[PDB]
PDB file of C-alpha atoms (C1' of nucleotides) and ligand atoms in Angstrom:
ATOM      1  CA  UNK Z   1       0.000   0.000   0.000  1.00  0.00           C
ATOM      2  CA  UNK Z   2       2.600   2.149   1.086  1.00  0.00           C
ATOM      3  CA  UNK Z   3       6.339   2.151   0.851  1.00  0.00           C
ATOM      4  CA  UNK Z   4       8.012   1.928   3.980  1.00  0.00           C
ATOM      5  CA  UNK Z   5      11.092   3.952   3.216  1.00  0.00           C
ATOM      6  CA  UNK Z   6      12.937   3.606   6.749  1.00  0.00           C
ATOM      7  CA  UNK Z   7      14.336   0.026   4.718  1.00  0.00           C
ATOM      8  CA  UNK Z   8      17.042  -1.426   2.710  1.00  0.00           C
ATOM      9  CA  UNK Z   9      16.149  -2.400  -1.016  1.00  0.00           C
ATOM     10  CA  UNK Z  10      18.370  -4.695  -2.903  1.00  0.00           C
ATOM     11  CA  UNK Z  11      18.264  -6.230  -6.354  1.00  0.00           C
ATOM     12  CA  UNK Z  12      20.506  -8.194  -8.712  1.00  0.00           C
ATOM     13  CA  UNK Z  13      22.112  -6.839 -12.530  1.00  0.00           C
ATOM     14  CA  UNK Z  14      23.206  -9.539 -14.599  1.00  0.00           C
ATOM     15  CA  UNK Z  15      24.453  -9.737 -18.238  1.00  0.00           C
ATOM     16  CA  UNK Z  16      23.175 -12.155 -19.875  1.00  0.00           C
ATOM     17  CA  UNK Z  17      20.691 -15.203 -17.706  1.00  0.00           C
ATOM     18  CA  UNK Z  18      22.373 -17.198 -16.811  1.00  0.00           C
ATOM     19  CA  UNK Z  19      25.361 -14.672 -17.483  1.00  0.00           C
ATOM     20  CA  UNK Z  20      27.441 -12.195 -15.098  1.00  0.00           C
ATOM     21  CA  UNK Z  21      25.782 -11.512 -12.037  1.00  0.00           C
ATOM     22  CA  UNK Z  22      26.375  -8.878  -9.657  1.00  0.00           C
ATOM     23  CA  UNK Z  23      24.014  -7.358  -6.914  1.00  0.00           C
ATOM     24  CA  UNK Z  24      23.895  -4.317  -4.612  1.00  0.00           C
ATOM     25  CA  UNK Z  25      22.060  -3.089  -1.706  1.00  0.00           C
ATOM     26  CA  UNK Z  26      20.767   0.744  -1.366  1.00  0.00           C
ATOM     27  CA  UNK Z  27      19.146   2.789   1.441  1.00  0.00           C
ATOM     28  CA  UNK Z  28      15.174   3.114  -0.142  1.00  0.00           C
ATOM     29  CA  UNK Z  29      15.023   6.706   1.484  1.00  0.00           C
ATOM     30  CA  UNK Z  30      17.741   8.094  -0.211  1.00  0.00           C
ATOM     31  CA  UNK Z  31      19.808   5.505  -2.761  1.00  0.00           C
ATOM     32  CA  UNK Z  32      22.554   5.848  -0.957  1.00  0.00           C
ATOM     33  CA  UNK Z  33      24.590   2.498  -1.924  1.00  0.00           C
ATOM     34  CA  UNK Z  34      25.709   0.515   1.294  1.00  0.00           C
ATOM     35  CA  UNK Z  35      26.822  -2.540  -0.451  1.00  0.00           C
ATOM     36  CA  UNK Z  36      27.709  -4.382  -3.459  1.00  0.00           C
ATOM     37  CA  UNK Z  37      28.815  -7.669  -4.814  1.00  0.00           C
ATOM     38  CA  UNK Z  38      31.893  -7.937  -6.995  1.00  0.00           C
ATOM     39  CA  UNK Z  39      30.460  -9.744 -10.144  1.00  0.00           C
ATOM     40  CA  UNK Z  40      30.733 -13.429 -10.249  1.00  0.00           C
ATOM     41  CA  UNK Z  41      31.057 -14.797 -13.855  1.00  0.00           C
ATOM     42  CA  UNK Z  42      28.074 -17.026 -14.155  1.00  0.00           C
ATOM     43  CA  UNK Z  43      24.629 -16.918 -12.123  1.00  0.00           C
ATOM     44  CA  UNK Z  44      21.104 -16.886 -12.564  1.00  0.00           C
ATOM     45  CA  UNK Z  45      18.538 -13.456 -12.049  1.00  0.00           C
ATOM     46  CA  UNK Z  46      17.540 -15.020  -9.390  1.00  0.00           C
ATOM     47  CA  UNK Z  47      20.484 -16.458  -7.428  1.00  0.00           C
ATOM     48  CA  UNK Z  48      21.756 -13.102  -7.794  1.00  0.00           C
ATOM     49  CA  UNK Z  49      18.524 -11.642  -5.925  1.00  0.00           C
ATOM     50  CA  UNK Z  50      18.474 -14.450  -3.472  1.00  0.00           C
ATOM     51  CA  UNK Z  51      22.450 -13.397  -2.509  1.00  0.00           C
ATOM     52  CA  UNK Z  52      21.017  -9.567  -2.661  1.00  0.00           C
ATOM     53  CA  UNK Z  53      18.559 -10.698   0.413  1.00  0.00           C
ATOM     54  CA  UNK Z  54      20.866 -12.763   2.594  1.00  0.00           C
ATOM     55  CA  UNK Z  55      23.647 -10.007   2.428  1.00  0.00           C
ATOM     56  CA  UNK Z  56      20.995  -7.690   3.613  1.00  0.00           C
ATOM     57  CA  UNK Z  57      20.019  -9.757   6.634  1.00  0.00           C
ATOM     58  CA  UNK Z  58      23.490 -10.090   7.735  1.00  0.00           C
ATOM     59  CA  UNK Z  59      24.485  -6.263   6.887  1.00  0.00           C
ATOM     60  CA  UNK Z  60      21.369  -5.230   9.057  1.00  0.00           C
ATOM     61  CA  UNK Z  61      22.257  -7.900  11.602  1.00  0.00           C
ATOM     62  CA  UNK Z  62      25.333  -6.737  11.848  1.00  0.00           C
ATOM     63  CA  UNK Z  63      24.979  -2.990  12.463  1.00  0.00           C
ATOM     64  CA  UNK Z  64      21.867  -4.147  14.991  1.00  0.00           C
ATOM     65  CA  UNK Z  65      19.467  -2.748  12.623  1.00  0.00           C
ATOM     66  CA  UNK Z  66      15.643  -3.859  12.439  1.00  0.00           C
ATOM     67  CA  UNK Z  67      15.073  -1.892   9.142  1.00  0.00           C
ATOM     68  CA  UNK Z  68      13.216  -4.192   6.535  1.00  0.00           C
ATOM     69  CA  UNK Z  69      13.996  -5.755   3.149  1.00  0.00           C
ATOM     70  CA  UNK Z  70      12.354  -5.082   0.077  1.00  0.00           C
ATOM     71  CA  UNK Z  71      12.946  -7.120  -2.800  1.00  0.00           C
ATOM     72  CA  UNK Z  72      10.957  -7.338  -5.961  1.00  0.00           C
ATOM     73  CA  UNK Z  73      11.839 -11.278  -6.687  1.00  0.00           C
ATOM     74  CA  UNK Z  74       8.975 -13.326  -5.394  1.00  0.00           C
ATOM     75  CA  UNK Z  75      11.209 -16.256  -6.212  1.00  0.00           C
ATOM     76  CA  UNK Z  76      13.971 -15.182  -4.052  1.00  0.00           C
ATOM     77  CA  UNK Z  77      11.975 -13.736  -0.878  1.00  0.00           C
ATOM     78  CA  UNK Z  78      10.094 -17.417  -1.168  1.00  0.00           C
ATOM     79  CA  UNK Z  79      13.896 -19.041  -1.417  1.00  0.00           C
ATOM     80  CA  UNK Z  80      14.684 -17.543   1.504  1.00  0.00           C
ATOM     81  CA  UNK Z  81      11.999 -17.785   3.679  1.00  0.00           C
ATOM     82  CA  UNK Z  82      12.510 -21.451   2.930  1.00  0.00           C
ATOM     83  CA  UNK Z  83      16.079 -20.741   3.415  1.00  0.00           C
ATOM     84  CA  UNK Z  84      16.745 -23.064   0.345  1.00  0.00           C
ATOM     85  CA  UNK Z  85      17.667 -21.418  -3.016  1.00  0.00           C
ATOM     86  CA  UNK Z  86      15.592 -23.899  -5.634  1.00  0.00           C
ATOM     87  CA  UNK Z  87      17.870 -22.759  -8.841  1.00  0.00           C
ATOM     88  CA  UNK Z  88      17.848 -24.907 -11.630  1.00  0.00           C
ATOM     89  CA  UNK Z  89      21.240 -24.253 -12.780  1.00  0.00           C
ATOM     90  CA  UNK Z  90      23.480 -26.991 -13.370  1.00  0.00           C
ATOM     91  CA  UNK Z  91      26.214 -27.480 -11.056  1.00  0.00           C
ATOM     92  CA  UNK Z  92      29.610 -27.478 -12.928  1.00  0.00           C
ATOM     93  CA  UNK Z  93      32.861 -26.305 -13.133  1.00  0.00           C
ATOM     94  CA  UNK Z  94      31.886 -22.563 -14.513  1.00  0.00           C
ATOM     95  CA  UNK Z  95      29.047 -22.772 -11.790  1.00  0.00           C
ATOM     96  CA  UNK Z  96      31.270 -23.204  -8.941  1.00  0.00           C
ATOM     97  CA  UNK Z  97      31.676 -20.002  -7.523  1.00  0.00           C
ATOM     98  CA  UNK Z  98      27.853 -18.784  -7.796  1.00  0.00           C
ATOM     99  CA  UNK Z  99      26.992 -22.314  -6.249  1.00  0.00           C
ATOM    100  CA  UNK Z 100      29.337 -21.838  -3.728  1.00  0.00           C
ATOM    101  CA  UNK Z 101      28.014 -18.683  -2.664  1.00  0.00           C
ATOM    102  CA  UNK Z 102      24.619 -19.842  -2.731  1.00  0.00           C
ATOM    103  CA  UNK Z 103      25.066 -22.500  -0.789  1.00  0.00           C
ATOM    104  CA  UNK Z 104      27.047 -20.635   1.628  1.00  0.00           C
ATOM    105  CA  UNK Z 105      23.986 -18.504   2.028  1.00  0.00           C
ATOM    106  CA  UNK Z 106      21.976 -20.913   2.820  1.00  0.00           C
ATOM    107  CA  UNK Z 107      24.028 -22.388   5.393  1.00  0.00           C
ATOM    108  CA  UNK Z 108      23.923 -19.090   7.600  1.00  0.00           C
ATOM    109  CA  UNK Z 109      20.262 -18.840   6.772  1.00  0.00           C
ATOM    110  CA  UNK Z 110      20.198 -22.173   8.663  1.00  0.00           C
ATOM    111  CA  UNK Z 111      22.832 -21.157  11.881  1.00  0.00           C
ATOM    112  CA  UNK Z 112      21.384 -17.804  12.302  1.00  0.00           C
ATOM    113  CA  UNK Z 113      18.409 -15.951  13.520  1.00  0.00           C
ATOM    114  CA  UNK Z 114      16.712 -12.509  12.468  1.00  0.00           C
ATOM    115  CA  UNK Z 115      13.602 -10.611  12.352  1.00  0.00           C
ATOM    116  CA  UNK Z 116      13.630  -8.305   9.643  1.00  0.00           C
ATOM    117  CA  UNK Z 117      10.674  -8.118   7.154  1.00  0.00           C
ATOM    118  CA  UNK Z 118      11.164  -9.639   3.975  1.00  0.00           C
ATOM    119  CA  UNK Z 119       8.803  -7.435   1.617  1.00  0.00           C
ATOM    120  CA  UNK Z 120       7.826  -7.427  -1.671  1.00  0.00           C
ATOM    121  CA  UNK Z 121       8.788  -4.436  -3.895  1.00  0.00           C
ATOM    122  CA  UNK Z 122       5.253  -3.685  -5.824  1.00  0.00           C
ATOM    123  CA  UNK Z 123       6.834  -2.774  -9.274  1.00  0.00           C
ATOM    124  CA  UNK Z 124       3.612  -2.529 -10.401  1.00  0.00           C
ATOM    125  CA  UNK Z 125       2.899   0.710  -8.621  1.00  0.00           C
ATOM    126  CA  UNK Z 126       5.655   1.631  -7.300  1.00  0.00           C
ATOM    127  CA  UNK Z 127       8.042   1.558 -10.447  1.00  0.00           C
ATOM    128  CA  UNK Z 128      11.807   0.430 -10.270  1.00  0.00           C
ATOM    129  CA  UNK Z 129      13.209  -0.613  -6.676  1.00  0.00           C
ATOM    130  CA  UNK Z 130      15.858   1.763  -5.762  1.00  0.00           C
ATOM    131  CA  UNK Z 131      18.728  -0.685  -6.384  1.00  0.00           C
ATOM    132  CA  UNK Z 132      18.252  -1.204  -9.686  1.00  0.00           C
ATOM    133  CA  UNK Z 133      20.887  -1.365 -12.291  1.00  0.00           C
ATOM    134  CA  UNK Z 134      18.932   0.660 -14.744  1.00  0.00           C
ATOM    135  CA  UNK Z 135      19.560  -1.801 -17.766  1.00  0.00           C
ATOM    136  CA  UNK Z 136      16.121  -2.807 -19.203  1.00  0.00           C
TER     137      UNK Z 136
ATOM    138  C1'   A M   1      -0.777 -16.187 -14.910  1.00  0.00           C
ATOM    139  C1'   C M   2       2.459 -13.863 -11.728  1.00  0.00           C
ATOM    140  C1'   A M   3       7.250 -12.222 -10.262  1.00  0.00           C
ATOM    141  C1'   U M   4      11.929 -11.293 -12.446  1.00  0.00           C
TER     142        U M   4
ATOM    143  C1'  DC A   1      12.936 -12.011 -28.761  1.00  0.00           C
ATOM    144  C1'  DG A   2      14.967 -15.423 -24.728  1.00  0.00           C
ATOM    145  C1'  DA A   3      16.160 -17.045 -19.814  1.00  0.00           C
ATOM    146  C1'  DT A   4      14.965 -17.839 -14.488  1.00  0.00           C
ATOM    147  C1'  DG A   5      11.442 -19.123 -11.251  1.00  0.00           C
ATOM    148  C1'  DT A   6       6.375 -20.223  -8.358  1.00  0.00           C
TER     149       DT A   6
HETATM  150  K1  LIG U 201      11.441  -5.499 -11.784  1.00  0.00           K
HETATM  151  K1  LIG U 202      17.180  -3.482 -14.979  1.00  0.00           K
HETATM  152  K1  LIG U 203       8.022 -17.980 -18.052  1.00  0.00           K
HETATM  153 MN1  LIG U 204      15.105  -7.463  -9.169  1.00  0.00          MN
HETATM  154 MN1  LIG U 205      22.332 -25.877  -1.100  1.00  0.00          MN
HETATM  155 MN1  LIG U 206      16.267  -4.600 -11.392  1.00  0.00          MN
HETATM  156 MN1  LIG U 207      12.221  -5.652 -21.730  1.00  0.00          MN
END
RNA sequence: ACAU
DNA sequence: CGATGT
């Protein structure tokens, strides 16, 4: 209905899907960008926004924030609040490192605790979330 | 269909 | 146009 702005919004950029994935992380108040990924040579869209939402929990975690999420993946918010990233990408050699980094994520979804919102960015009426890479 |  | 996902 409304946005909450007191949050962090995150989203992935990719080139090409599956391609080059990166992802960053932006106050929604004021775009200020608080983090970013160094891009990792092959990923999915939505691997890439799945990473985007763990780094968030454990950036607000870390600074003892209770701000929430938004995210405009449905995939990834569901991914996460089964705190298991359902990608179909095949696991290879040229996979490693996004697979890695998934699964990594997954396994401090699964050792850690956290309230923070999860919330759905409504594109829809809303237009772009904040952290978006501009590129459509 | 909806969400990327 | 095509890919990733529920
Ligand atoms: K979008
Ligand atoms: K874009
Ligand atoms: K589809
Ligand atoms: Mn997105
Ligand atoms: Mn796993
Ligand atoms: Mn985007
Ligand atoms: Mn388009």
């Amino acid at each position: 209905e409304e946005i909450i702005w007191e949050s962090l919004s995150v989203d992935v950029g990719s080139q090409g899907n599956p391609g080059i994935v990166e992802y960053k992380g932006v106050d929604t108040k004021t775009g200020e960008v608080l983090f970013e990924r160094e891009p990792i040579p092959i990923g999915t869209n939505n691997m890439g926004e799945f990473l985007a939402i763990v780094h968030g929990l454990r950036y607000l975690k870390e600074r003892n924030s209770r701000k929430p999420i938004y995210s405009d993946s449905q995939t990834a918010i569901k991914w996460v609040k089964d705190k298991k990233a359902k990608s179909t990408l095949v696991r290879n050699e040229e996979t490693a490192l996004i697979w890695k980094l998934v699964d990594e994520a997954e396994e401090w979804l699964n050792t850690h605790t956290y309230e923070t919102p999860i919330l759905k960015w409504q594109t829809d009426k809303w237009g772009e979330i904040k952290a978006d890479y501009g590129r459509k």
